[PDB]
Specification:
Bound molecules: biotin
Strand content of chain A: 15-25%
Radius of gyration of chain A: 16 Å
Shape of chain A: globular
Protein name (chains C, D): Propionyl-CoA carboxylase complex B subunit
Largest interface: B-D, 48 and 42 residues
Oligomer: part of a larger assembly
Largest sheet of chain A: 5 strands, mixed
CATH class of chain A: Alpha Beta
Family (chains C, D): Belongs to the AccD/PCCB family.
CATH topology of chain A: 2-enoyl-CoA Hydratase, Chain A, domain 1
Distance between the termini of chain A: 43 Å
Organism (chains C, D): Streptomyces coelicolor
Helix content of chain A: 25-40%
Order of helices and strands of chain A: HHHHEEEHEHE
């Protein structure tokens, strides 16, 4: 049932459940109590119902600084992918405040490159949903280097494909 | 008919050659010559007859039973292609119904429990395409890899796949050349390429490494990395070592890289990993040597012979339930179809010959 | 000041040499009201835009967003150098250990500021250097400051035939 | 071997100098099985593709498809030279007179091989030279072999400013 094709389908239903609920069930309750929505609930209300195609849903960090490798949430504290708004293509990231306060790290930076580079490639808008405490301090300079590679591909895009930031 | 002498190097340049059993022959040098040169005695049919070009040489694409067929195959080939490399391949757009059929579901099974049991990749293809229609090229040549055309939403798409049934789906000089110059064709015409991945590696032997695998296996890597046109990959089962890279990996520029739960994506097979890792923990106490080693094998295969590492580090966009594949490839090649990507200025590349 | 100068010397094909010694952005409620956020962006946008050879040398302090600004490799600077006295970190030790110790400092206020001054020394000793940035190839080399004039020469010699462009556009949309 | 070398020196703008002495393709059932037809094409495809100055000199033997391969004028070679001892023909005399005599040889086997050896001499005397190719301007000149180093110099001097391109394409589709 694991060594068996069926078992390995019923594994990837388990890790889909764990991935979509990365953030703990007090952290989500705290977010609601602050009148905020959760990053997924944001993505739905943007994109045309059913379009979503989530990329790097099973991403995980690779930092073992300051015992940050005690937990490696799937997604690494951002929800990224592609779909349609009003039946027109558009690539989206939604930072997850539930996960590590939503602090940016290396992986959860390199996801918001992958989306960018997919927009630039295809020629489609990027709608960036923002909700983060700041830099993931555990990952030191790493989580600066991620910011930089975003801020290079915000400039490269600039005037080419519309970039809209939704600060929440 | 006959195509003899230098002539043959016209049809060679040309994208696709169609040849009709028992009544069409190609040869640079006639049997007469090669007798009184090389003392060898050979008929026309064997020398260069349809079958012999289709299966052996890797020169022809198709061998039709009769002319009428052959003409029909040629009209089929045109169907998939644009008139010239400034237009995109003729479409009859349909919008596909992406609720999970009972065809779809069948995918969720058709990878057997035993790694070794084979299963026809021709299915996994025909699952995804329009009307389950696959128009295969070069069937008789390098069966261990499958190339051809169909449609997704009424739009042409090119298909490259490893075919477990043959050689286990291992890549070999012949499959790497057959696939390489299919991809390049699809790319130059702007037709998209969909790649299905089962591959345990490259089929060992001394021959292979004399003939020049090194150069002639490279071909396929070059073709993928060169390609602009939409590239969607799906790993069903096995993806080891370089032969993972080769098969339309992300590292070469493939847009969207899916992997089924069954996928195994790892430097090398677990016995031939456990070896090199544990060669001083399997040396200690020759007593119960194997008992450990086939332990450390059965931990390797449970730890690393799965999609999930290559997921964590975004080498495969998504691990997906095999049912879902004809949704992903749909709503992938929607986005893609405005892919815009190019390779540095240059009169031509320098791909290995 | 620096944004418009970088642009100028990237429009008229003049190589830019940076030198880096920046603790961070000036803290004030004026700076924020008067749009730092838009008007500090300009510098990042100039760096990333520019396609004439960029060579950066961090002399001393390079923390957080300011490190990124100052002709960092992330924004497509060619050759990034650092002296031994470069400190390249998310943010000052004090601020760092306030967030990544907060607990074991709140523990036993008996010796709070104390254990926290120790922790500040530790974090400075561990990460207040160019040796993690080095490891990850954010700075090409760590150099002996005397060797800053050689690297700049040899680097520009190579760099002159740099070919680099930004995707087709009528113009960018930089912060105003 | 030769295809990939020609490409290399046509990608990096290096002129190619050919020398031609080729009876034809190796006859075997291996060569054909192992895809001569695709893998001999590569050379023709490299020649015709290449847009850096091409200068060819036929020293001796140049028959059939092999003549075409070897940097012939048909595949867009600039300046084609031939020495007096160049033989440029569809195919060896013997093979030629076997097909374009077949009758008057089958006549009277009394002196078959004989009249056929004579015919072989004739056809060699008539067409086994560079004088029909000359007539039709397939080879610019017939030269005295000593004058092969002058023509190559003077020819390259001119040829250097050669401008030539192939129709717009992402890439070709050469035989693999
Ligand atoms: O079926 C046959 O006739 C024999 C097989 C090969 C025939 C050779 S190919 C060149 C030559 N031209 C022809 O029309 N027949 C022979």
């Amino acid at each position: 049932d694991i060594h068996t094709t069926a078992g390995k389908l019923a594994d990837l239903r388990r890790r889909i459940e764990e991935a979509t609920h990365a953030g703990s069930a007090r952290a989500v309750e705290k977010q609601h109590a602050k009148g905020k929505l959760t990053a997924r609930e944001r993505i739905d209300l943007l994109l045309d119902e059913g379009s979503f195609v989530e990329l790097d849903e099973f991403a995980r960090h690779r930092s073992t600084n300051f015992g940050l490798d005690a937990n490696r949430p799937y997604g690494d504290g951002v929800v990224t992918g592609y779909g349609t708004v009003d039946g027109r293509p558009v690539a989206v990231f939604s930072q997850d405040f539930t996960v590590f306060g939503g602090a940016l790290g290396e992986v959860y930076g390199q996801k918001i490159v992958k989306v960018m580079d997919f927009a630039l490639k295809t020629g489609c808008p990027v709608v960036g949903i923002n909700d983060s405490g700041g830099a993931r301090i555990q990952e030191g300079v790493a989580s600066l280097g991620a910011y930089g590679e975003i801020f290079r591909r915000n400039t490269h895009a600039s005037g080419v494909i519309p970039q809209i930031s939704l600060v929440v | 008919g006959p195509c003899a002498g230098g002539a043959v190097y016209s049809p060679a340049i040309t994208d696709f050659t169609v040849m009709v059993d028992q009544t069409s022959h190609m040869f640079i040098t006639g049997p007469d010559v090669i007798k009184t040169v090389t003392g060898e005695d050979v008929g026309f049919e064997e020398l260069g007859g349809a079958r012999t070009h289709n299966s052996t040489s890797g020169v022809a694409h198709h061998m039709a039973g009769d002319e009428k067929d052959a003409v029909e195959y040629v009209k089929q080939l045109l169907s998939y292609l644009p008139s010239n490399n400034l237009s995109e391949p003729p479409a009859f757009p349909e919008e596909a119904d992406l609720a999970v059929t009972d065809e779809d579901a069948e995918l969720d099974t058709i990878v057997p429990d035993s790694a070794n049991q084979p299963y026809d990749m021709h299915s996994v293809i025909e699952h995804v395409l329009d009307d389950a229609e696959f128009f295969e090229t070069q069937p008789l040549f390098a069966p261990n890899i499958l190339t051809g055309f169909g449609r997704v939403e009424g739009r042409p798409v090119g298909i490259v796949a490893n075919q477990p049934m043959q050689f286990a789906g291992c890549l070999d000089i012949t499959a790497s050349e057959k696939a390489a110059r299919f991809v390049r064709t699809c790319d130059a015409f702007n037709v998209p390429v969909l790649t299905f991945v089962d591959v345990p590696g490259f089929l060992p032997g001394v021959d292979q490494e004399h003939d020049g695998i090194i150069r002639r296996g490279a071909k396929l890597i070059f073709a993928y990395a060169e390609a602009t046109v939409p590239l969607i990959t799906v790993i069903t089962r096995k993806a080891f070592g370089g032969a993972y890279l080769v098969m339309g990996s992300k590292h070469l520029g493939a847009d969207l890289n899916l992997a089924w739960p069954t996928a195994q994506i790892a430097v090398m097979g677990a016995q031939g990993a456990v070896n090199i890792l544990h060669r001083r923990t399997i040396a200690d106490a020759g007593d119960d040597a194997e008992a450990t080693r086939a332990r450390l094998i059965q931990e390797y295969e449970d730890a690393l012979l799965n999609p999930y590492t290559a997921a964590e580090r975004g080498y495969v966009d998504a691990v997906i339930m095999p049912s879902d594949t004809r949704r992903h490839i749909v709503r992938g090649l929607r986005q893609l179809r405005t892919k815009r990507e190019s390779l540095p200025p240059k009169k031509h590349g320098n791909i290995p010959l």
